[PDB]
Symmetry: D2
Subunit: 461 residues, 4 copies
């Protein structure tokens, strides 16, 4: 008589289960942690509030936490990123999950609140796993008594870590966190290669546009922008890159891209005259990758070539000024998560108007909104780190420490390099790769143990 969930359609559960079983064979690091720790039950007693895209890959993460002893209550961290068959399979396994593709904003907040509350009162949570910081924020602002009993947060993504570091800096962070994003097997695997796989995937599912021979502009060249730029260049696009960071821009140049600014001389003074109209008028596709605000702004959108595609693969939709478009232009739904925005005016449009832009996922994360986000074998790395991070903070038991000891432990840390390497090793074996073992002489020669770690903590890969 299990009813403690809310999903689009429970009858999709068998299909979700078939895909979970396939995904297990694509996730050797995650499944190796199941096998290694299931006897020991290191998460026995853990009660995890989880807020992360409810995909098939997140289903394997959830069932790994459960197989190691945890109970969980789960929601998605984006209104479009759930795969409904995945949510259905998790609900059908007796796991509380509140998630469906195509939530409204009010439904989004309600789903998170249903994980926090059970039977109308605070659940006895003692761990948090978050992607972007929304659940973390709600707990600090609205449920501080609950954080008193929480041992830690394990945060997935660059934007979430930034929000954690602001709270730490301000003295408002109440529990320690592990920055899962900055493991190498996360940031330089998921953020880069995952977007390489899934950006052109989403754009093809959304539009079925030929990409070869067309012009793209990628805003940002951090890990996501590097992977995005490659997603498009490998399809034959002519890709230009914008950056505020000259080091990242130097990389874009050396990687064979032309580095351009939307603004003359790079000076974003807020005027229409600032816009490089000749450049924007030739762009067929713009992608935002920054985690920053209003990097595809109203004046750029006015100057874009007719029928250009606009999308965002950073965490939040305010990279693009969609608010301006809602206020001024008429939206025509092509199909779910694909809209034509008619720049002819706000009240109605001609069905044969040629002066429109195509917006994907209403500006939300496009790889998850129009496709299925990153593939299982990439998320394997991210999610093995999540499990290791959950084990570490749960075993530390911050909430039970005296106040003076808490003060020594209140920080945002990454996992040790040695664990990062062990995750990577299982990923390499998943491809059939064979890592060589140093001889004792060779290990002495470079100053490392034969077992690693093989690099100093400052190494950038």
């Amino acid at each position: 008589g299990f009813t403690d969930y809310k999903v689009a359609d429970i009858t999709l559960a068998a299909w979700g289960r078939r895909e979970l079983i396939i995904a297990e064979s694509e996730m050797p690091a995650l499944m190796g942690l199941r096998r290694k720790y299931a006897g020991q039950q290191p998460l026995k007693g853990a009660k995890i509030l989880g807020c992360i895209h409810m995909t098939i890959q997140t289903g394997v993460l959830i069932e790994t936490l459960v197989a190691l002893g945890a109970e969980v209550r789960w929601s998605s961290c984006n209104i479009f990123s759930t795969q409904d068959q995945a949510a259905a399979a998790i609900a059908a396994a007796g796991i509380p999950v509140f998630a469906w593709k195509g939530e409204t904003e009010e439904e989004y907040e309600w789903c998170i609140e249903q994980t926090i509350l059970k039977d109308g009162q605070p659940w006895d949570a003692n761990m948090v796993l978050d992607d972007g910081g929304d659940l973390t924020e709600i707990l600090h602002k609205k449920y501080p008594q609950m954080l008193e009993r929480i041992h830690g947060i394990t945060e997935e993504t660059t934007t979430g870590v930034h929000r954690l570091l602001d709270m730490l800096k301000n003295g408002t962070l109440k529990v320690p966190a592990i920055n899962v994003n900055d493991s190498v097997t996360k940031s330089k695997n998921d953020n880069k290669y995952g977007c390489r796989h899934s950006l052109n995937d989403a754009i093809k599912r959304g539009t079925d546009h030929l990409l070869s021979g067309k012009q793209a502009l990628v805003i940002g060249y951090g890990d996501v922008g590097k992977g995005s730029s490659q997603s498009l260049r490998q399809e034959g696009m002519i890709v230009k890159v914008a950056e505020v960071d000259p080091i990242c821009a130097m990389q874009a140049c050396m990687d064979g891209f032309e580095v351009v600014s939307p603004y003359k001389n790079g000076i974003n003074d807020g005027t229409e005259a600032s816009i490089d109209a000749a450049l924007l008028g030739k762009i067929d596709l713009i992608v935002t990758t920054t985690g920053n605000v209003n990097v595809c702004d109203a004046n750029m959108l006015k100057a874009l070539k007719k029928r250009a595609v606009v999308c965002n693969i950073g965490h939040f939709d305010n990279e693009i000024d969609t608010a301006f478009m809602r206020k001024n232009w008429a939206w025509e739904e092509v199909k779910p998560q694909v809209h034509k925005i008619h720049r002819t005016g706000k009240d109605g449009f001609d069905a044969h108007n040629d002066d429109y832009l195509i917006l994907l996922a209403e500006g939300r994360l496009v790889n998850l909104g129009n496709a299925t986000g990153h593939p299982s074998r990439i998320m394997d790395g991210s999610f093995a780190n999540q499990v290791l991070a959950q084990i570490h903070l749960f075993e530390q038991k911050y909430a039970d420490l005296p106040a003076a000891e808490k003060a020594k432990r209140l920080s945002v840390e990454v996992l040790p390099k040695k664990l990062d390497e062990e995750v990577a090793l299982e990923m390499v074996k998943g491809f059939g790769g064979v890592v060589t073992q140093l001889t004792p002489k060779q290990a002495e020669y470079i100053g490392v143990s034969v077992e690693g770690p093989f690099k100093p903590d400052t190494y950038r890969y």
Copy 2:
């Protein structure tokens, strides 16, 4: 009446000068420092012992130091890396330089010592610029009193930083140092993209072999291994990668390479039975990139496919067991720095034997030995960092400090990120790239100053 030099052919000086004038137009960061600091003369009083490949690019570096006030005495840090027209142009400008392509080991040592000694007595040096640590070693072992006058060392490359760190840990480093290698505009510019440009260059010059369609094995996948693998893959080689570091091996898999070991299951027995003979029997080209010892060992060389090319682009020739090949196999010079190594025995070869390997540059740095090393526009980043590091240590005046201040400053440091970004910006402008300026609101949104630095010190790019 200038005679304080030793080069191959002083009449090459006009040709060297024409190439230096071209190189200046390719090195906007270096030339920007020349313009910015010429008036201040920040290196007036500096007496720099320099040991680094006497290329055209190093000539621009040397003449930037001199233009900022320095005196120098120069040698090359490798017996095959000098460009003789560069050495001549520098000597013809009245600068002491002792360097030619094709030195013997004894001549190499004599050259360093001609920089250290002036008129048979130790020069009154007070600064050191080094690439690989040979000059640094000699000063510490053979001229330790000269280090009483020296304010610091600025070290170019990964292997030399390793050696500095060992002395630091042993208490044997006598003067502070700047690790120039680990600026991002050095390690992730020079070490990776320089080798991408110059590895296939050197193999083409040495052999004129078609690379497309042939099998390569790159040993190592750090920065040099990454750029080398791309040098070969972009020519159409089928590239396999070996690694001892699982994180680097994970990157190779995601970059689209098969990861293999020369040894069965990765276990280096020392026995012939441990060699994967089927794999090595198909390899047309092996390239070592590790900075480690004997990573292309005698049993691997015996197993390689007939007529395979063997080369090393790490800093020292002991990556490849060339001593085994000298002792046991007969060497045929094709032309300078290209030898066929006949596996038929030691006592003479047949001109038409088919069982030989081709060794480039006798196993020394192949891009410098068989071509011209990295191009000017890439060395621009490395050498701008060198100049900044020289100004910083010279101004700190370590040797003039009380012993109390000395212990506090005796360290191996990197340049601050702000300077790294300023170097990157000049490189970007040299491609005609335009970096965007953050608005106040955007800078506040991501927590940075509009002028940078744009990333925390932990960021990996």
Copy 3:
């Protein structure tokens, strides 16, 4: 849908509005085809034409259908594959009052029924006088079962390599009854569609069907003609380690020089029918096999037994007999993951453990995977192919073969390609769609290389 219109059969007519929105987008991606619509509309060159059409009922085909109708033609349409229809495209066409019989996921019986519904109107042969085909099935049915109808048909315009082969066989046997245009061998078809279309759509279909990471995995592409070239690139550009098999040494040479290792599934290349002939070590490392040949049983039963566990198997050539799926149906249990995705469990026939690890993933039951698991080629590519189709239909319809006396019929009974000038004109509209600018020769330059300033720019022997 016009009042009283029931002459169609599609999955769901309520998908029509969606299809129409996608048709309007596709028009903006198809400048060559829409340039013909604009150039020839007032002339109505297909007035009186009655075209039986058999080709994948996609959005791209919808723009083709509506261009023919806009030029005067009547049509009756079916798909040439049981999984290639886009149901919203079919609904939009049915809702414009155009007879179409097509949906995604037909049985073989339904497939044949659909073609027959184009041929028969109200239980009697329609008065067709033109044929547009993709693969030769409609052509074969007409020749075998309705020969009298070919008496009124002025020609066939055939889309694809496999269908051209079948026409040339009939021509060689004296059994082709009407002239045909080989649309496939326009350069703006073969070297555009067959190659770049599969580049776009092969990795697309594999992602949609499996969501597998492809970077760092091992692929084997069987064949390296135009489809094999595009397919290999689709996978290599994703980071796959791609090996190529070929029987043609010249195509194999191109694969070597393009940076691929060239291998055979069989020891020394010799396929003697024994298990001992299979290179088991090679096949046991392959994560993905793609067949591209137009040939039979190039991924045979002994290969399927030796493939690495959990490898993906698919076919992007025209017919499903590239892979021995009959063997898998006879011997192994099929698990449907979702439509057009099956796990084939090699442990036995009449059951499988839900957690079995010894299965293969077969996409689209061995049928054209780009069309079965994604949407086939993109509009801007099909633009080339379908502008040639329109030109070819105009040319045979104006030639009026069925009206000529016996004397001029023997003269005109041929299989021909479009002239190069027309190929260039299609290409020029494609280039302009990318915003490309073609340079004009000066008179002295045109004289120097011996062409007119207006072209054609190459001899007919030129290979591009």
Copy 4:
């Protein structure tokens, strides 16, 4: 006492021989022909006049013809393409060769005449092997009596075939010819992949410029233009492509290139106003690939970005208007085949002037002029076809036929596809590739013999 030759330095012969021995192992199709036909001596009595770039690869071709029974007299078909060690090795073998790197035009004509005349009288020639048609033209215009006794011409390259067809059309062609260029194992191997290998090779040897991140403009996208554009794109250049043929331009678009014209709207009306100065002012490198005349004209040269590199990889130097540059601008030799062209005037130049272009090889084919042209394993295909073509025309004995029979055979033909395939099979085997054999049922299914040919003559590959 062999003196019937003229080369730069006969003492280079030993080095040239070493490189020939390496090249033989890189040329399996050609050495397969040696082994297959040596006992038959199918060219016994052939006396071949040869005019083609005197490289190591041509040396293997010459000695294959000689091995099959031919005598030859040889010259190069370009003033800068000879490798002097290859010329020396051939002369030292007793083979008449007249060729060196850096001929004047008068020397170039004298060298061809030295092949035509032996001891001041027409040699008893009976075969012609040509590259570009210069020897063919001289024989028709000045030595018609020799052509009465010549059985045929085997012509290497697009431009020479064009010249032959013009003669055939005008009725001035005196002997039949085989178009070697249009074997697939020539045109779609040599013309494309050869230039892919050797264009960036020459540019690096000439300038040592970084290419990644810079802007290139390739004029033409036939086989040479396709391979040249890949040569640059694979180095990270941003490549734009110009074309007059819309089908080739469509291919460039689909291959991921932006297709532009030097002229506004592509109309070359001869006025400076017609030049797209904005576009050309951004180009760092222009490469001509057309076989046409003046496709990099005076107004384009005036408009190119300062310090742009200019080169031609088509057969003749009139693709670039170098005449204009000699008449108006001052030339500064950097090193052989590398010139700065100072656009400040004809009247000398300032050594530090910034307004120059770098011209490679004085506008002659840059891959052979500034490097070594195509690699052995690629030229293997072209030269196995040359050998088969010589055998075919020599055995047909056209000169010995009655006039009515000559009239039936006077044509320009290609080799049969079966031989094209047999050449390709040897090439594939040299890479270790394994071609599959059709079963009888499969061969029946697709309508071919198990032995091939596998494609109809109309197939384009």
